[PDB]
Curated annotation (Swiss-Prot), chain A:
Name this protein carries in UniProt: Methylcrotonoyl-CoA carboxylase subunit alpha, mitochondrial
Subunit organization: Probably a dodecamer composed of six biotin-containing alpha subunits (MCCC1) and six beta (MCCC2) subunits. Interacts (via the biotin carboxylation domain) with SIRT4.
Effect recorded for residue 17 to F: In MCC1D; asymptomatic form
Modified residues (N6-acetyllysine): 63
Places the protein is found: Mitochondrion matrix
Positions of modified residues (N6-succinyllysine): 63
Disease: 3-methylcrotonoyl-CoA carboxylase 1 deficiency: An autosomal recessive disorder of leucine catabolism. The phenotype is variable, ranging from neonatal onset with severe neurological involvement to asymptomatic adults. There is a characteristic organic aciduria with massive excretion of 3-hydroxyisovaleric acid and 3-methylcrotonylglycine, usually in combination with a severe secondary carnitine deficiency.
Purpose: Biotin-attachment subunit of the 3-methylcrotonyl-CoA carboxylase, an enzyme that catalyzes the conversion of 3-methylcrotonyl-CoA to 3-methylglutaconyl-CoA, a critical step for leucine and isovaleric acid catabolism.
Full protein stretch here: 519 to 622 of 725
Curated annotation (Swiss-Prot), chains B, D, E:
Annotated organism of origin: Homo sapiens (Human)
First-tier enzyme category under EC: ligase
Outcome of swapping residue 302 to M: In MCC2D; severe form
Disulfide bond positions: none
Alphabetized UniProt keyword annotations: Acetylation, ATP-binding, Disease variant, Ligase, Mitochondrion, Nucleotide-binding, Transit peptide
E.C. no: 6.4.1.4
Effect of residue 178 to N: In MCC2D; uncertain significance
Effect annotated for changing residue 133 to Q: In MCC2D; mild form
Mutagenesis or variant effect for residue 245 to R: In MCC2D; has some wild-type residual activity
Listed name of the protein: Methylcrotonoyl-CoA carboxylase beta chain, mitochondrial
InterPro entries in alphabetical order: AcCoA_carboxyl_beta, ClpP/crotonase-like_dom_sf, COA_CT_C, COA_CT_N, MCCB/AccD1-like
Gene Ontology terms for molecular function: ATP binding; methylcrotonoyl-CoA carboxylase activity
Residue ranges of every copy of the CoA carboxyltransferase C-terminal domain listed in the record: 272-518
PANTHER family membership: ACETYL, PROPIONYL, PYRUVATE, AND GLUTACONYL CARBOXYLASE-RELATED, METHYLCROTONOYL-COA CARBOXYLASE BETA CHAIN, MITOCHONDRIAL
Length: 104, 526, 62, 526, 526
């Protein structure tokens, strides 16, 4: 989604507006997003909180995870560099139709 | 050629200094107090009301906004504290309405959503004022208006303050009609019951969206918001299955507005300030009697802490200069002491410069108490202060005002107070606003009484004077508190100083949606 | 009624076209006679008059 | 943000269905008939005339256009069938003139070339009308006009229909003078004899090019088109050795117009429709009595088959919505049944929306016969149908009309008929146009006669009625044929349905050369 | 100061001269022929139709106009001869419609009334053209339009010439919508049946009046024109008891238009010409081969016979100068021989002068046959004649054309022919209009044949040539007759020469209702 926002920003005259950021920032409170993902037949509810520093706090059931990462390109393949609860890993990311493919 | 090296503002504060330690501690407590109060307001009506709201299949009002705006985009909420302790025994979190500016389909829009969990969405007198303020902001900046309508009608016990007058509920429809005539899109989404007199809001809109089962529009399902309203009556332009579907439809409607933003001002790449923003806590503090250099505040909000001061050594109690915030050009006017004749003249000259070049203006209000100077032949100030009041009023460039300190008397008017239609007005948690400072008022009261007592010959004892003075001081403190002022809509919100740069950047970006007009001045009384 | 609102909206357009000042004589009736009368029909049309009256630029006296 | 997924129109037709097989077969035959007739018109006067034309060193008229326009660029020819069987014993292929829109030096221009092989280039009454239509198109869209002049003067036997009236030959020079005053370049290339009264065309042009030996201008070489005209008389601005040289000079002249195209509308990347265009053969067929869903036609011409329907469930006999063709925004209005009061109101509302946002409008006319409903209290329709006739007339956005079916009575006017100045008007090979459908007319005639016969008391027998009816049906069929209508200039051409998307894309692109004006409406009779 | 004495035009004709006696006798016969033919047209359909019309309680169409206009005010009727012998076996007096300009409540208005006694008020092809011409006159001069509607619908046998095209019946509603958007009042009075497609005329009007029993509006009393139309349907704005009541209501409606006439031109007191107008009979005659001094015509129509000639001795075949008619300033251009290069240049210079000063222009067309000069190197004329065609076309001052003689070829265009949108165009009973004069045409035909015969070697005998020539001469005479031209709407009427001054005064007065715009010229090909 952030990459799509940057792509749209490229073609706009107001190139540097703070609205073009993907910070998800609010005044005096923190934005928490309710996302749903399906693993097999199971629906997983993820509560994502946009932190000021740019990281994300994700809660799945009773467990909380501190997530931070970015997208980089090697050749023609997009790679996701992420760290979950201090554990760093790299994987190839492909999003086709409604399926997210993570190759590690 | 933009390769010239230039000087930068700001200095490193003495973190070890006791004054800095005390100022940081006091300001931090105010910010923490502000944060936790907003958290409570975030909950609206309460758990029972929220549970009932969700039980009907409807989204919570703030979740609706989250889904409406672009993913991850910031949302500038306005007047979060409207109705805070305004009514004696009734709690009305946020006034029963949520207003703010967010990006929908890449377009900045004004979003006005009723909070059905608060008193069933009834319109209190402050609720009308908050909505009218939002409409005024949208019109002045040409921002499309999106109404997430879920309301219970006017609050009958206070009807006299809602229905009749020009700035009462009737003005809401007048604003919709005027904006429509100017091609400022009006979009209404009926996501809940529309009561008597609220049925007009869907009808007065250019395009309208109604939810299948929840929505009802009638001047319940059979009478209005029926498939009758969608098909037989034709009041509905789009038919939505649920709240999520309606929000998806709204995004499509905005994408078809055939609007593209155009900038009238020159743009330069953005740069962060050279000093941390949180240092403003130590620099400013919470004691209005102490003074600080406004340049320090400027150095921590402008791009690269670069500032070109105008008439630096003339009328030094006022600071004026050119800078840039997020790439936009801005002319900054800030108080650095008591206003003098030279300061007023210097300000009047500066405002003409900005209007000529079509440069947005930012005002930083911090007016000083009269404890230092009883009169100082203020008659001289009157002749010149008006020249600034008159230039500021006629200026047509976008104007934003930030009260970082006191705001008293005619100094408020000269620095673009609420009465002078700044595009936005914000206040820091440490500000105070009144006709005069509290102490001065007491002295004035004391003199009148002592002298009148003298005519009687009755002795006004020292104790008598103190007794008279104490209530007055208390009233002034209570009524100048930032919360009192924000509870009523006198400002657009109380903001954390660390957030000053971000709020200004969002506000100026929204204000640039409208073309800048030529400024016509009145007679300058030389 | 719906017809009354439509008739008013048509008239206001005529006056604005010819730049004729408008005078309004308000005497609205209580609902003792009619409890509802399907007022939902009135909502669709009453707005057309609210919107024409607001935009009219001829002098208006009430 | 434009990443939202949306629904798309269209469904896969049943290729095995007998109806689809029959409809495809019938429509294909019509298209093949259209193609071969154009091939014959392509040959102009004939082999003997063409051989004589080339023997003089001159290029054939269509070869001139091929060399004039940019290499490989498409050419939108207009009114190919003008004069088709118009005159009893005279064959006038294409009316003796070739008109169309092509790109010269990267600029869209209107090209008007006389066909000297057809009656020596004489001006028949249809020839004047075709040229006047081309000039009207050029002026409304600000397209430079290029006249490839090779003419033999007016056709004396039909002078009364060429010379005198306002829309007669005199209007041609009036149009040139008006366009010149508006900075719409007028370029004339005299590539052959200019007869009496045609000498004005080179003179009235802003810039003029004449061929050395072939060109003659006189109100033959010595009298006019002489080196005298080029030098002694000064009527000629450029001197060309041959046809190829003149066409090369014309391209240089256009390149010096100092014109650059500017778009008033928002643009998005183009996308092909999700369904094949040739399926329109099976879907539509040639039987006007059968009905089809106009949405199917829309799904096969708009970018990505994406369509946002407006008031879908209200007045369902009319379909209105927003789409994009080759990236341009368009508002589409198409018939899906008999017009009702709700349909007219829905259309009137939609047209106001498009005019407010400056969105081009496309009309798809397919009006229905009255076999299904004799009257249906049509008096109700009159009150509302006018509201649409009045909104459509005043709309200032570019308007394009495509007749994909019947076009009868007042339904033609409401759907932007020829009388309402659409920028372009096209018809499919299966259309019919008349005051009323043929059957209805017969019935009307029958009733009058039967009743009048009754007053006499003479018996109008069943046979008598049929005998009366048959001629009427025949006349109406003959006069509603697509060829009759296109032979006269009522439309701008008959187009293959598979080419609908391309023709619309070229037409809208040309129409955007002129800035879109603000729309002023009359009184809406509420 | 306006006390200067000046010279006056005109000379006393020799009443005893044989030429004057013959010319007076011939012209008088033409005028008498014109008068008696109008008398017959005055009767419309006939005694039986008129008796039936009155038997229904309705006023006759011309009596309606008499009662509508102000008492005793003159009425300028237009195109009295439309449809005169136009159709082979059908007599259509005046085209079935009466159009003209009269004063209603002190305001000049265009009145368009259907003649129900003629074919029951059906719309023939000429009927549509006459109405469209009236609407064009009203729009160009900002005259309110009053429609006295009593019609029977379109004439089905000729539907193809009524319904489809741009200048067909559909254009009538388009004109109404456009005029309404420009604040040119449209008033409809339904005084009889309104048929299918005519029901739009009452609906498209700004204000509407319908008669109680006679009027019927339906896309009979129950279906339309009912108390249903007046009250239940709301199509009717005013309800009238009878024809007299409706006409009284119409006068009230016009009085409420809040319109006041304003003049852009300077005004001087009116003065009668110094010579009798009826002397024009002897001076002009009916023989176009003889020549007369156009100054004599001018001397008998301008105020006080005062005329300031411009460039008198240069290009003497053309006369240009300034005068006044009924106090209005006018620039007069009249032919006095064959057009030359000097004459065209002189005219072009004069037209620029009038446009600069915003002076109305009057053209007096009397072009000469080519019997005197076969060619005269007409190529020189082409270079200059265009300069005049181009100046005349772009002129924005009101233009009125009067054909007092021949009007042939390109000379028609240069002298503001019908194709160049003069506000009005009138012709005298002795005029002839054609592409070329009849004799010349014959010669041209003769040469082609004789030469082609020579290639064959077959002898074209002297008898053969004459036989070829006679039919051509006959055709040209038949088709150039003033009646042929006026039967079709090429001019606005045939006027008696003695009435020339009055008609011009009324026409110019009406044309001044619209403000005069600035003239923008094209490129003058020096």
């Amino acid at each position: 989604e952030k990459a799509m926002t940057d792509t749209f920003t490229l073609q706009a005259h107001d190139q540097f507006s703070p609205f073009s950021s993907s910070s998800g920032r609010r005044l005096n409170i923190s934005y928490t997003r309710n996302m749903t993902l399906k693993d097999g037949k199971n629906n997983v509810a993820i509560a994502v909180t946009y932190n000021h520093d740019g990281s994300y706090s994700m809660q799945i059931e009773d467990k909380t995870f501190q997530v931070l990462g970015n997208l980089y390109s090697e050749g023609d393949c997009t790679y996701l560099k992420c760290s979950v609860n201090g554990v760093a890993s790299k994987a190839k990311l492909i999003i086709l139709e409604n399926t997210i493919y993570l190759f590690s | 050629y933009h390769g010239d090296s230039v000087a930068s503002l700001g200095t490193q504060p003495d973190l070890g200094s006791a004054l800095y330690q005390e100022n940081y501690k006091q300001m931090k407590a105010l910010v923490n107090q502000l944060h936790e109060r907003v958290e409570h307001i975030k909950l609206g009506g309460g758990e029972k009301a929220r549970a009932l709201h969700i039980s009907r299949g409807k989204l919570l009002p703030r979740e609706r906004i989250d889904n409406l705006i672009d993913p991850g985009s910031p949302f500038l909420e306005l007047s979060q504290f409207a109705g805070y302790q305004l009514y004696d025994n009734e709690e009305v979190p946020g006034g029963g309405i949520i207003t703010g500016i967010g990006r929908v389909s890449g377009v900045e829009c004004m979003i006005i959503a009723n909070d059905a969990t608060v008193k069933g969405g009834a319109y209190y007198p402050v609720t009308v004022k908050k909505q009218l303020r939002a409409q005024e902001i949208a019109m002045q900046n040409r921002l499309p208006c999106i109404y997430l309508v879920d309301s219970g009608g006017a609050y009958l016990p206070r009807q006299a303050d809602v229905f009749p007058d020009r700035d009462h509920f009737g003005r809401t429809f007048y604003n919709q009609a005027i904006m429509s005539s100017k091609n400022i899109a009006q979009i209404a989404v009926v996501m809940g019951s529309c009561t008597a007199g609220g049925a007009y809001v869907p009808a007065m809109a250019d395009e309208n969206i109604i939810v299948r089962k929840q929505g009802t529009i009638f001047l319940a399902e059979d009478l209005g918001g029926a498939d009758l309203h969608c098909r037989k009556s034709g009041v509905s332009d789009h038919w939505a299955l649920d709240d999520h579907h309606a929000l998806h439809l709204t995004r499509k409607v905005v994408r078809n507005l055939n609007y593209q933003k155009k900038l009238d001002v020159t743009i330069e790449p953005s740069e962060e300030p050279l000093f941390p923003a949180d240092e403003l806590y130590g620099i400013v503090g919470a004691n209005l009697k102490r003074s600080f250099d406004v340049r320090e505040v400027i150095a921590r909000i402008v791009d690269g802490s670069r500032f070109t001061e105008f008439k630096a050594f003339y009328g030094d109690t006022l600071v004026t200069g050119f800078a840039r915030i997020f790439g936009y050009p801005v002319g900054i006017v800030g108080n650095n002491g008591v206003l003098f004749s030279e300061s007023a003249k210097k300000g009047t000259h500066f405002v003409q410069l900005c209007c000529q070049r079509n440069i947005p203006l930012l005002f930083l209000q911090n007016i000083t108490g009269f404890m230092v100077g009883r009169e100082y032949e203020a008659e001289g100030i009157a002749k010149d202060g008006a020249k600034m009041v008159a230039a500021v009023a006629c200026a047509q460039v976008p104007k934003i005002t930030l009260i970082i300190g006191g705001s008293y008397g005619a100094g408020n008017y000269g620095m673009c107070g609420r009465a002078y239609s700044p595009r936005f007005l914000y206040i820091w948690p440490n500000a105070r606003i009144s006709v005069m400072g509290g102490e001065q008022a007491a002295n004035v009261l004391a003199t009148i009484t002592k002298d009148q007592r003298a005519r009687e010959g009755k002795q006004f004892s020292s104790a008598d004077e103190a007794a008279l003075k104490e209530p007055i001081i208390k009233k002034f403190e209570e009524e100048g508190n930032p919360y009192y002022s924000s509870a009523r809509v006198w400002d657009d919100g109380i903001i954390d100083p660390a957030d000053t740069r971000l709020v200004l950047g969002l506000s100026f970006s929204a204000a640039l949606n409208a073309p800048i007009e030529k400024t016509d001045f009145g007679i300058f009384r030389m």
